[PDB]
Amino acid sequence: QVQLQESGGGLVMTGGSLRLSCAVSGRTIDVSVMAWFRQAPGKEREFVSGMRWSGMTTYSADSVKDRFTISRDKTKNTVYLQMNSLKPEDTAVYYCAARSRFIVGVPQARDLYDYWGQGTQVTVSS
Amino acid sequence: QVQLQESGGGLVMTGGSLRLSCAVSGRTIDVSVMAWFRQAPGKEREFVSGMRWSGMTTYSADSVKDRFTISRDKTKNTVYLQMNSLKPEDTAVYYCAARSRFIVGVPQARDLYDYWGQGTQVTVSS
Amino acid sequence: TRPFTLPNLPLSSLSNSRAPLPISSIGISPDNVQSVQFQNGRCTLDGRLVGTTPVSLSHVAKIRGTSNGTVINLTELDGTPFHPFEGPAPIGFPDLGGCDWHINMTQFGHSSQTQYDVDTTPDTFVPHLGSIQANGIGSGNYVGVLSWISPPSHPSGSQVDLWKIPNYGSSITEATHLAPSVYPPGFGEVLVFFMSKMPGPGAYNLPCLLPQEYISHLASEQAPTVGEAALLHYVDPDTGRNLGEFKAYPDGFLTCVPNGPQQLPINGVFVFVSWVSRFYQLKPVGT
Amino acid sequence: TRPFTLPNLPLSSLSNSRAPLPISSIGISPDNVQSVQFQNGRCTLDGRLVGTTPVSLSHVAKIRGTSNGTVINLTELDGTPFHPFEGPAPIGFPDLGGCDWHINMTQFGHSSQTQYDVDTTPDTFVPHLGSIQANGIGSGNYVGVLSWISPPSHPSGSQVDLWKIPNYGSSITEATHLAPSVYPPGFGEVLVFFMSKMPGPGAYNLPCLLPQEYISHLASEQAPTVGEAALLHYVDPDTGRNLGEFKAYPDGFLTCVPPQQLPINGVFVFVSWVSRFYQLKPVGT
Ligand code: NA
Ligand code: NA
Structure with missing residues (x-):
């Protein structure tokens, strides 16, 4: 069993920066992928970015690839989402997600992830 | 590995009886099915009758069901085929076959069997 | 699908x-x-x-750790560190309650085996914190498998x-x-x-x-x-x-x-x- | 297919x-x-x-049998008889050559474990005939698993x-x-x-x-x-x-x-x- 706890959301001005964090606890020994998803009002939940937990590979959606960055803390079991040059379109609930079952690569399908956080709200105002 | 050795073929008059025997040696612990097949000149190897090695169930092809009988010796590791009321259509090479891989029931496809005997010739004359 | x-x-x-x-x-x-x-x-x-x-x-039902004669400090079976305050025990740790365990302990690079007798009830048995009582197991690195119970x-x-x-x-x-x-x-x-x-x-x-x-x-x-x-x-x-x-x-x-x-x-x-x-x-x- | x-x-x-x-x-x-x-x-x-x-x-790498203090008469792991002259050894019998074995022996219904030391070279080591030398294991029924080698x-x-x-x-x-x-x-x-x-x-x-x-x-x-x-x-x-x-x-x-x-x-x-x-x-x- 794995527990995910997000923090770091809030209100931010267009063009500003914000960093989300997700504390990963429990059976972390065989977590293989950590990722961020987001769901905007009236839209479906979408993949933002993911990384091989213990590897190097990362992958980000096209609409955020040159602005967002995922990473893992070198000390604690925390994954970060660095969001730069934010736009009002980025307003959503951002969810932390974990996959422990064996897989090749970084999957983008929400149904392939095993653990989900409660979500943190990010509002980009103009 | 399992070794099979047939014996008991020969010439028989139409309407007579004959009993073939098959000596089963080697890794018999997990042989699950023993069976008899038959091949006529120019024809494909066909299932005659088979039995669950350690169970009771037996099964024979329609063309022999009321005349042929398969059984296992209570003492030695020997499978028998009792062939009664033989007809010229029964002339063939009769093969002893063993299956060790797990299976439900008595299979009839030649390709599902794991071990084969060298064959004994049966000739039914009128 | x-x-x-x-x-x-x-x-x-x-x-x-x-x-x-x-x-x-x-x-x-x-x-x-x-x-x-x-x-x-x-x-x-x-x-x-x-x-x-x-x-x-x-x-399954194995342990790995370093005894200092007083406690065994547990790791994962491959030697990877086990972090405390995260889970019940390392992967594969025995989960049989209601009994004493007798674990066969061996070592990579040394001869012989040692029987390790485990009461799981006292406060020194705390695999959640990475540590369990040594109960006479001398200092060294061991791998153990559950062997019998009482x-x-x-x-x-x-x-x-x-x-x-x-x-x-x-x-x-x-x-x-x-x-x-x-x-x-x-x-x-x-x-x-x-x-x-x-x-x-x-x-x-x-x-x-x-x-x-x-x-x-x-x-x-x-x-x-x-x-x-x-x-x-x-x-x-x-x-x-x-x-x-x-x-x-x-x-x-x-x-x-x-019905059974x-x-x-x-x-x-x-x-x-x-x-x-x-x-x-x-x-x-x-x- | x-x-x-x-x-x-x-x-x-x-x-x-x-x-x-x-x-x-x-x-x-x-x-x-x-x-x-x-x-x-x-x-x-x-x-x-x-x-x-x-x-x-x-x-895998287990034995089962009854010792009479002189030989262990091997069976399959569930107790099923192993007949001689049929195969190498019962299912799961250790196949490590080029070493001595040390096998941890336990019993159903009895306490304790016993280390069983096996030389595989002598004329008494004949699992193909269903028996191997007891080398001091007392009479009784045991199940054993390979523990370490030398x-x-x-x-x-x-x-x-x-x-x-x-x-x-x-x-x-x-x-x-x-x-x-x-x-x-x-x-x-x-x-x-x-x-x-x-x-x-x-x-x-x-x-x-x-x-x-x-x-x-x-x-x-x-x-x-x-x-x-x-x-x-x-x-x-x-x-x-x-x-x-x-x-x-x-x-x-x-x-x-x-x-x-x-x-x-x-x-x-x-x-x-x-x-x-x-x-x-x-x-x-
Ligand atoms: Na405890
Ligand atoms: Na020998």
């Missing part, structure tokens, strides 16, 4: 998932056991391992009770992030267990929720759990007869309605039939 | 098939080893068990050599119906071995041909062997890159063209059926 399957193998050729032992029978729990909370042998139907459950039997040292005079799990925590703190309990969700249903004979000074039967080979199969297949419960037949390989219908639930356990199931032969095979409702009414095994 | 597959699991999470030990590396055999004749870990690609190979790790008592001074199998027969009669030898097929190919660290007073590495979880997988799937060889990729789960091409043969072993430096966290994936003489590209190149 990959279809859900179970191994095409008879139960009698498979292994317990709480110790490396052949399966010898199928059984149900006594009337006083309604739920269980095993930490090994825990796998969802789409292949997610929980608790301390490993993929492979070569990790009645628990405490409470004095109690019997072996393998329906329990050990106390992974202590009076310092409770263990966190355990695999949750499983209970039978349907009408008249009871949990089904795969049993193995356990060496020791009694007639010990170790129950588990799934054979180890089912676990490695599910963890590999990762078939989407598209329904609420998996209808199964237990099939006799001699006749092909259906010996009883069972339900497998997504948390990774089986139920039946008893304990008297079923062990040479059968579980075959998936279809996805059914959580409340599909099973007919009694046999009747 | 059921398609051929291999488990979707990383090698490092699997087990050796000659002892209940984690896999820790990939390796090839030394120059002095041409063939191997392991009796455990032997399974065809359509799932047929040979030798003493069981379906499950819970039977250099063989005979010939004196020889080293541990886990490429060997024990002498299942005697000078009176050879053991029969052994799983046959496996040889390197040629074309620069070498056999691939899955290695495990084995306890004892040395740096002992135990090789096997197939992880045990592959065996129970093939024994369950029973996929028809439609071709002469199964081309495989060893895939890195991080990048998805193909770390090397391999061939699995119907008799149940893998080869590559040079592996020892490959990472152990990859997964073998079936690609297609190819010819017996299909030329592999060297691992890496």
Whole structure:
């Protein structure tokens, strides 16, 4: 069993920066992928970015690839989402997600992830 | 590995009886099915009758069901085929076959069997 | 969508998932056991391992650690550090409550074996914090496998009770992030267990929720759990007869309605039939 | 026709098939080893068990029998009689040659464990006839599992050599119906071995041909062997890159063209059926 706890959301001005964090606890020994998803009002939940937990590979959606960055803390079991040059379109609930079952690569399908956080709200105002 | 050795073929008059025997040696612990097949000149190897090695169930092809009988010796590791009321259509090479891989029931496809005997010739004359 | 399957193998050729032992029978729990909370042998139907459950039997009911003559400081079986305050115990750590353990300890690079006797009840037994009492095991690095069990040292005079799990925590703190309990969700249903004979000074039967080979199969297949419960037949390989219908639930356990199931032969095979409702009414095994 | 597959699991999470030990590396055999004749870990690609190979790790490298203080009369692990002159040994019997065995013996219904020390060279070691010397184990029924190994008592001074199998027969009669030898097929190919660290007073590495979880997988799937060889990729789960091409043969072993430096966290994936003489590209190149 794995527990995910997000923090770091809030209100931010267009063009500003914000960093989300997700504390990963429990059976972390065989977590293989950590990722961020987001769901905007009236839209479906979408993949933002993911990384091989213990590897190097990362992958980000096209609409955020040159602005967002995922990473893992070198000390604690925390994954970060660095969001730069934010736009009002980025307003959503951002969810932390974990996959422990064996897989090749970084999957983008929400149904392939095993653990989900409660979500943190990010509002980009103009 | 399992070794099979047939014996008991020969010439028989139409309407007579004959009993073939098959000596089963080697890794018999997990042989699950023993069976008899038959091949006529120019024809494909066909299932005659088979039995669950350690169970009771037996099964024979329609063309022999009321005349042929398969059984296992209570003492030695020997499978028998009792062939009664033989007809010229029964002339063939009769093969002893063993299956060790797990299976439900008595299979009839030649390709599902794991071990084969060298064959004994049966000739039914009128 | 990959279809859900179970191994095409008879139960009698498979292994317990709480110790490396052949399966010898199928059984149900006594009337006083309604739920269980095993930490090994825990796998969802789409292949997610929980608790301390490993993929492979070569990790089941083993320990690894460094004794300083007073405590053993635990690591994962491969030597990877075990972090405290995260889970019940390292992957594969034994989950047999209600007994004393006798673990066979060996070393890479040294001769001989040592029997390590474990009372799991005292405050020095705290695998959740990475540490358990040495109880005379001299300093060194060891790997150990559960070898036999005996009645628990405490409470004095109690019997072996393998329906329990050990106390992974202590009076310092409770263990966190355990695999949750499983209970039978349907009408008249009871949990089904795969049993193995356990060496020791009694007639010990170790129950588990799934054979180890089912676990490695599910963890590999990762078939989407598209329904609420998996209808199964237990099939006799001699006749092909259906010996009883069972339900497998997504948390990774089986139920039946008893007539019974304990008297079923062990040479059968579980075959998936279809996805059914959580409340599909099973007919009694046999009747 | 059921398609051929291999488990979707990383090698490092699997087990050796000659002892209940984690896999820790990939390796090839030394120059002095041409063939191997392991009796455990032997399974065809359509799932047929040979030798003493069981379906499950819970039977691997175990013995069961009744000692009379002089010999142990062996049975199958469940107590089923083992008849002489049929096979090498009962199912799951240890197949590590080139060493002395130390087996942990326990009993159903009795306390304690006893270390059983086994020289496999003498004329009293005859599992093919159902018995092996008791070497001090008192009368009773035991189940035992291989625990650690040491250099063989005979010939004196020889080293541990886990490429060997024990002498299942005697000078009176050879053991029969052994799983046959496996040889390197040629074309620069070498056999691939899955290695495990084995306890004892040395740096002992135990090789096997197939992880045990592959065996129970093939024994369950029973996929028809439609071709002469199964081309495989060893895939890195991080990048998805193909770390090397391999061939699995119907008799149940893998080869590559040079592996020892490959990472152990990859997964073998079936690609297609190819010819017996299909030329592999060297691992890496
Ligand atoms: Na405790
Ligand atoms: Na011998």
